[PDB]
Design an enzyme around this catalytic site. Structure first.
Site, PDB file in Angstrom:
ATOM      1  N   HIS B  96      59.274  -0.498  -4.299  1.00  0.00           N
ATOM      2  CA  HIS B  96      59.615   0.848  -3.877  1.00  0.00           C
ATOM      3  C   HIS B  96      61.016   1.071  -3.328  1.00  0.00           C
ATOM      4  O   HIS B  96      61.409   2.215  -3.077  1.00  0.00           O
ATOM      5  CB  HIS B  96      58.591   1.332  -2.857  1.00  0.00           C
ATOM      6  N   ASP B 119      52.244   7.413  -0.150  1.00  0.00           N
ATOM      7  CA  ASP B 119      52.364   5.989   0.100  1.00  0.00           C
ATOM      8  C   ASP B 119      51.473   5.624   1.275  1.00  0.00           C
ATOM      9  O   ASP B 119      51.137   6.476   2.100  1.00  0.00           O
ATOM     10  CB  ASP B 119      53.830   5.676   0.454  1.00  0.00           C
ATOM     11  N   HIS B 121      52.455   3.317   3.330  1.00  0.00           N
ATOM     12  CA  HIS B 121      53.534   3.078   4.284  1.00  0.00           C
ATOM     13  C   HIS B 121      54.602   4.170   4.231  1.00  0.00           C
ATOM     14  O   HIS B 121      54.734   4.869   3.225  1.00  0.00           O
ATOM     15  CB  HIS B 121      54.201   1.747   3.967  1.00  0.00           C
ATOM     16  N   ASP B 123      57.994   3.439   4.983  1.00  0.00           N
ATOM     17  CA  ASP B 123      59.220   2.781   4.521  1.00  0.00           C
ATOM     18  C   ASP B 123      60.466   3.412   5.118  1.00  0.00           C
ATOM     19  O   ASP B 123      61.542   3.380   4.524  1.00  0.00           O
ATOM     20  CB  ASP B 123      59.295   2.812   2.988  1.00  0.00           C
ATOM     21  N   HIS B 136      62.315  -2.713   0.595  1.00  0.00           N
ATOM     22  CA  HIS B 136      61.323  -1.814   0.026  1.00  0.00           C
ATOM     23  C   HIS B 136      60.581  -1.079   1.144  1.00  0.00           C
ATOM     24  O   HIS B 136      59.746  -0.208   0.885  1.00  0.00           O
ATOM     25  CB  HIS B 136      60.334  -2.581  -0.862  1.00  0.00           C
ATOM     26  N   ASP B 227      53.571   5.707  -4.353  1.00  0.00           N
ATOM     27  CA  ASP B 227      53.422   4.275  -4.158  1.00  0.00           C
ATOM     28  C   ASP B 227      51.978   3.911  -4.466  1.00  0.00           C
ATOM     29  O   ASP B 227      51.077   4.302  -3.735  1.00  0.00           O
ATOM     30  CB  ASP B 227      53.738   3.850  -2.722  1.00  0.00           C
ATOM     31  N   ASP B 229      50.239   1.598  -3.755  1.00  0.00           N
ATOM     32  CA  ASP B 229      49.439   1.010  -2.700  1.00  0.00           C
ATOM     33  C   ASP B 229      48.764   2.157  -1.942  1.00  0.00           C
ATOM     34  O   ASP B 229      47.778   1.960  -1.220  1.00  0.00           O
ATOM     35  CB  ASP B 229      50.293   0.119  -1.763  1.00  0.00           C
ATOM     36  N   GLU B 272      55.628  -0.012  -7.203  1.00  0.00           N
ATOM     37  CA  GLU B 272      54.839  -1.116  -6.656  1.00  0.00           C
ATOM     38  C   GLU B 272      53.751  -1.828  -7.454  1.00  0.00           C
ATOM     39  O   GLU B 272      53.134  -2.754  -6.925  1.00  0.00           O
ATOM     40  CB  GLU B 272      54.259  -0.699  -5.309  1.00  0.00           C
TER      41      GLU B 272
END
Ligand code: NNH
Ligand code: NNH
Ligand code: NNH
Ligand code: MN
Ligand code: MN
Ligand code: MN
Ligand code: MN
Ligand code: MN
Ligand code: MN
Lengths: 314, 314, 314
Positions: B96, B119, B121, B123, B136, B227, B229, B272
């Site tokens: 990412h 996402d 997260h 980031d 990332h 993302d 994830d 990702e």
């Protein structure tokens, strides 16, 4: 009130072998017994026998139309029969093309009925749209009036009379619709709730609306055609067409549940369970069970619990 | 409208090997082909080549900053290029941290753009917060103006110009935030929707708001940085950081779906996906697919169905 | 504010061996350490020792009533003790019949307390309803006033004083209720939220209501009795009674989360974790973890993130 179970061990609707073993497993899971434990009077009509039409010619792409025409004709009759006596018909598939039968017969005794179609697919293709002869993906076509004559008469179905209009049916769970079908459902202004709608509104509101939308004015009888592929593949994996991101076991029971509470159930369809399509025993077992539990749901069982009236458990 | 696909097979953002194999699998799944079947004009720009900066010194903790500075610089340029011609850029990661590139370039042609960051997260760590050099996990830092200069210039990023403010970005799916990041997001009053908010409001309302919040006044272009994830680990298991209790495959498609309906998509990020991190083949395959389906979602495909206009399927 | 952890390694409540190993694993997962990292002052009271009543005769069907009477008596005392000093008691089971203890003791210091019972089961059977001696399925009976004397005094419980009424308790997560229990909960007009209600309203509204319903007038202290079987079996598989279609890991954290935000937490129960009942290590580990995370949730940790006040992370 009474309950008569009917097995429609049929599979000529689609190309995968097993669906006919359907009602076999459902019973072998104790569907009947459990149903009895409820406040409903249950009776088992056993499983119909479906004479095989020799040399069934594929009317265009549409396949085995004659086998699927007599099986559906024979069924409708049996349904109308019990529907006459005032009992609630619980058809066990067998693929979903047995809806043509189950619903038509039902319609006879109550032509004012509304249909709630919990399915991943719409099965509203006509012999003019399908990319497969699979009739199990066309049932709504042979039943919709607004689609009557809109396609060449089909060998073996001549006996069917379009019994409901695009304003008495409601879809819940749609997530894998063919171009043609999408056209037709939009054109004929049908009321649905695709996964995206459920996603947005919440199974709670979905029912809330589908009800007022179908029982706002005059309260009619309800025909619940439940396609087990309609819950997500995690919960009812043993089917013809798994299709990801579908109704959840909970929402599945939230639906059967609110329908029971309306007290307007008259006919039920527990279709598409294919006891042979499980990647592991457990999977077939999950399927069958969540299928069974969906039924008993329709007939009483609340996740909050049930206590037989008049008795003092204290 | 046109669509140009770009592969950013990169991985210097984080310590796990595989992410660069990312766009490889996404294509090998037929991402392109499918995209073509849609109403969009698609073109494959192939996969960028990322020259490796010899002796990449770890600027403090921050790692491989130079490799990650040229890869991101090179990308942004390619993006601005297609953004110029009026096409929608679909970046394929690769980790990412390629957001720094993808977004900056995009900003060039449309500096009025808003960003939706789905996402797990945020980031949003700066080289001053991170507990790992993993860039990332910092992209938003190099792009946020309110965080410009707030940290020592980083080797290789000198070329970046903070292009957006904390009032043009919206997070959806947050569930594993570092102390520092939490501080910064609260301080800079950023608009987010952590799992708890989604939990509470419902993906339905989330979008509803995130939209008016970003397109209430003036309707701008949208940059969707997704993302993988961000969905729960059950649905997109093959990633760098699985983090439980995340967005579901459905909500995942409910988002890509409402964004498509706004007709304001201009840039997309499918980051990702690590085809090497699957506990079993199936897992990698689940990941890739739900990833692909998320994309095609962004570009048309509705779970209700799609029928090509003008044609009479009847 | 302070936090004292208490282990109630007990299992005489039900027939499955392991639950006593419960608090052992919870700690071995770092429950304490993590709790410390929060804004709460934590202290470990170690794990109680439960003297085994020799020749424990099965009072009717009810089993091991004496062992379960002293363990619960001993506990309540320890609880009232810390409750006195003003600290929040976090009981670790051990089966759920340790609620009798945990809650009674708590009641002592705050008899105005309200109880939120997140469980798959109601455990409101009396020695007159149960189909098993399993006391872990009766706790609410020994605590409900409206059920005082409604059953033959039980050997070893004589020390208990019905501390709360059916108007100060709320169930969340019910999905496997025994006839008797259903009767009693309906009769005594108890406020609950079965899976069907959650399904319908949405964990969001559920809390929203359960709160006003219990803290509309006078804001009292809250006792959260969380039965790990209450989340769905996918998320907390290592238990005595998995029961499908339950609360999800997210909703699980949405609850512990809104309770923390009310600032009225006084006592917590992390019961039923059976580190021996996992079909695979991972399963036991999933369980323990989501259990731990549920706790830390109750004490602060938000899925959006946490930043220690006063400090400038910038
Ligand atoms: N499994 C189903 N329906 O239940 N598939 C329908 C797919 C397609 N519409 C067809 O006619 O083949
Ligand atoms: N996988 C991700 N982001 O996509 N992790 C971010 C974790 C942490 N904030 C970091 O910088 O390492
Ligand atoms: N696992 C539980 N409760 O936590 N089971 C309760 C089942 C039943 N009501 C009983 O008393 O046995
Ligand atoms: Mn169907
Ligand atoms: Mn179907
Ligand atoms: Mn990210
Ligand atoms: Mn992430
Ligand atoms: Mn319990
Ligand atoms: Mn329980």
């Amino acid at each position: 009130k009474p309950i008569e179970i009917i097995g429609a061990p049929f599979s000529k609707g689609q190309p995968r072998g097993g669906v006919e073993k359907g009602p076999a497993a459902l019973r072998k899971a104790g569907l009947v017994e459990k149903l009895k434990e409820t406040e409903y009077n249950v009776r088992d009509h056993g499983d119909l026998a479906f004479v095989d039409v020799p040399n069934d010619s594929p009317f265009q792409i549409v396949k085995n139309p004659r086998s699927v025409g007599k099986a559906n004709e024979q069924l409708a009759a049996v349904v109308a029969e019990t529907q006459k006596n005032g009992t609630i018909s619980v058809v066990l598939g067998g693929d979903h093309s047995m809806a043509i039968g189950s619903i038509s017969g039902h319609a006879r005794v109550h032509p004012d009925l509304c249909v709630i179609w919990v399915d991943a697919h719409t099965d509203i293709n006509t012999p003019l749209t399908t990319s497969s002869g699979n009739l199990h993906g066309q049932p709504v076509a042979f039943l919709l009036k607004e689609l009557k004559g809109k396609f060449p008469d089909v060998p073996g179905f001549s006996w069917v009379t379009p019994c409901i209009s695009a304003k008495d049916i409601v879809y819940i769970g749609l997530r894998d619709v063919d171009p043609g079908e999408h056209y037709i459902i939009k054109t004929l202004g049908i009321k649905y709730f695709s996964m995206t709608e459920v996603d947005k509104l919440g199974i709670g509101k979905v029912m809330e609306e589908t009800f007022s939308y179908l029982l706002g004015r005059k309260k009619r009888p309800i025909h619940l055609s439940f396609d087990v592929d309609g819950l997500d593949p995690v919960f009812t994996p043993a089917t013809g067409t798994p299709v990801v991101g579908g109704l959840s076991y909970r929402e599945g029971l939230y639906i059967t549940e609110e329908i029971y509470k309306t007290g307007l159930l008259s006919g039920l369809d527990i279709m598409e369970v294919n006891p042979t399509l499980g990647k592991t025993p457990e999977e077939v077992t999950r399927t069958v069970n969540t299928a069974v539990a969906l039924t008993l749901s329709c007939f009483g069982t609340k996740r909050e619990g049930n206590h037989k009236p008049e008795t003092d458990y204290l």
